[PDB]
Design a protein around this ligand. Structure first.
Ligand SMILES: CC(C)C[C@H](N)C(=O)N1C[C@@H](O)C[C@@](C)(O)[C@H](n2cnc3c2c(=O)n(C)c(=O)n3C)C1
Ligand SMILES: C[S@@+](CC[C@H](N)C(=O)[O-])C[C@H]1O[C@@H](n2cnc3c(N)ncnc32)[C@H](O)[C@@H]1O
Ligand SMILES: [Cl-]
Ligand SMILES: [Zn+2]
Ligand SMILES: [Zn+2]
Lengths: 116, 301
């Protein structure tokens, strides 16, 4: 019943004081885009940076299987928007946070479905 | 003057017409560096200015465009240029990349190994190459036309570039090839493009625009590289990152360029005119299939 848990390992390494994964590929963009979390072209808004998706995927970057049973990557070949305040560790951010299935924003960093 | 606000500088036509001899390249701003926007890699900037420059040419841009990108791995194991190409190309553009060493990419398919191990039966609408071996930087031995990957690249163009397709091939003072310059005259137009962010380098991208399958003009590639170095040596380019801040017109305009399947007989002057104007691509539109040759060996004794 053994599989390696890469997500936990990274989370624990960050808590031990480890340096975040680097060389996530930051894109040049207008920073007037939609703000959505994962998109086919950079969509950073004023408070976000856009990155090449593969370079922000723990599984891509560590040469290990994706958690999906099909192994499909939700980041590869797309662009992820990271809050500028969290751009020092994009891989950390994508790992820890979850995209709203409804509006397409990061839960807690854009999604307001839960209002009114 | 205004060059600083461009993405870069193309070799002016009068320099192409010269017959200079090859000199060592001596750039006055060698060593100087452009001021990149906060946190932006040199290679993202460089590919961005290249794509900005390509937006000014007559690129064919069909539906279900096919682009292949050689030398796309970096020393950090990711593919910055590929990320820029994919941002630039229309959504859904088939994008394949390759490099000698393993790397993580946003390309639809990635092939690792020497470029000569790469085979496809499909034609391509756009070939991009950043292949470069830095050992070919020795200033203590003659600067001869180089082979290796450039020989593969010349063959890949003649064999696998659709008519009306375009190319951008990275060269430097010592990383260059005479036949590739010659092949530039098999396009409707060509240039050597220096990005403003890397203007302190002898790097340029040899750009062939709208491939015609045949010589339109005759180019001696040894002479032309000498003309290129002559241009570089006498036209200092001011390092600039200015164009990187205005991304509003960056996306490649999806032209819906027409695709036809034709034989070598059916290529008349009307066709050639449309090829030359970026309004036609000639290739099949089958499914795209690539493969990587694998050497098989058993070392146990
Ligand atoms: C300190 C800074 C880094 C450079 C500064 N400008 C300089 O001090 N130099 C000293 C000069 O006396 C020798 C010369 C002419 O070689 C240098 N140079 C100019 N262009 C070059 C080169 C070069 O060395 N190589 C390997 C190249 O490829 N190119 C294109 C310039
Ligand atoms: C200037 S770098 C490419 C950087 C990359 N395009 C990026 O966006 O960061 C040089 C690349 O060309 C590749 N290269 C050199 N010779 C090659 C060959 N014969 N076949 C395949 N790749 C080669 C190297 O592996 C090397 O990573
Ligand atoms: Cl890593
Ligand atoms: Zn992944
Ligand atoms: Zn929501």
């Amino acid at each position: 019943a053994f599989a390696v848990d890469a997500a936990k390992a990274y989370k624990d390494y960050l808590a031990s004081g480890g340096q975040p994964i680097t060389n996530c590929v930051k894109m040049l963009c207008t920073h007037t885009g939609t703000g959505q979390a994962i998109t086919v072209t950079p969509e950073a808004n004023m408070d976000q940076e856009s990155f090449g998706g593969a370079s922000c995927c723990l599984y891509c970057r560590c040469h290990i299987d994706h958690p999906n049973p099909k192994g499909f990557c939700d980041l590869k070949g797309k662009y992820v928007q990271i809050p500028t305040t969290c751009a020092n560790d994009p891989v950390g951010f994508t790992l820890k946070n979850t995209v709203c299935t409804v509006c397409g924003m990061w839960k807690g960093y854009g999604c307001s479905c839960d209002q009114l | 003057s205004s060059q600083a606000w461009q993405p870069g500088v193309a070799m002016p036509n009068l320099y192409k017409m010269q017959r200079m001899l090859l000199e060592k390249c001596d750039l006055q701003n060698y060593g100087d560096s452009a001021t990149l926007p906060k946190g932006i890699m040199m290679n993202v900037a460089k590919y961005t200015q290249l794509c900005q420059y390509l937006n000014t040419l007559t690129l064919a841009v069909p539906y279900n465009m096919r682009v292949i990108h050689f030398g796309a791995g970096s020393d950090k194991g990711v593919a910055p240029g590929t990320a820029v190409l994919r941002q630039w190309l229309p959504t859904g553009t088939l994008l394949v990349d390759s490099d000698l060493n393993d790397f993580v990419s946003d390309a639809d398919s990635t092939l690792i190994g020497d470029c000569a191990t790469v085979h496809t039966a499909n034609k391509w609408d756009l070939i991009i190459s950043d292949m470069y071996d830095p050992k070919t930087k020795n200033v203590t031995k003659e600067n001869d036309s180089k082979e290796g990957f450039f020989t593969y690249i010349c063959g890949f163009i003649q064999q696998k570039l659709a008519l009306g397709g375009s190319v951008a091939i990275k060269i430097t003072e010592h990383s260059w090839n005479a036949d590739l310059y010659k092949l530039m005259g098999h396009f409707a137009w060509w240039t050597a493009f220096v990005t403003n962010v890397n203007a302190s380098s002898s790097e340029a991208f040899l750009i062939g625009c709208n491939y015609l399958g045949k010589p339109r003009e005759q180019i001696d590639g040894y002479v032309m590289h000498a003309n290129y170095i002559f241009w570089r040596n006498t036209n200092p380019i001011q390092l600039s990152s200015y164009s990187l801040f205005d991304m509003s017109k960056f996306p490649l305009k999806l032209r819906g360029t027409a695709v036809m399947s034709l034989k070598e007989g059916q290529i008349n002057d009307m066709i050639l005119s449309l090829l030359s104007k970026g309004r036609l691509i000639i290739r099949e539109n089958n499914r795209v299939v690539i493969s990587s040759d694998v050497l098989v060996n058993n070392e146990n004794l």
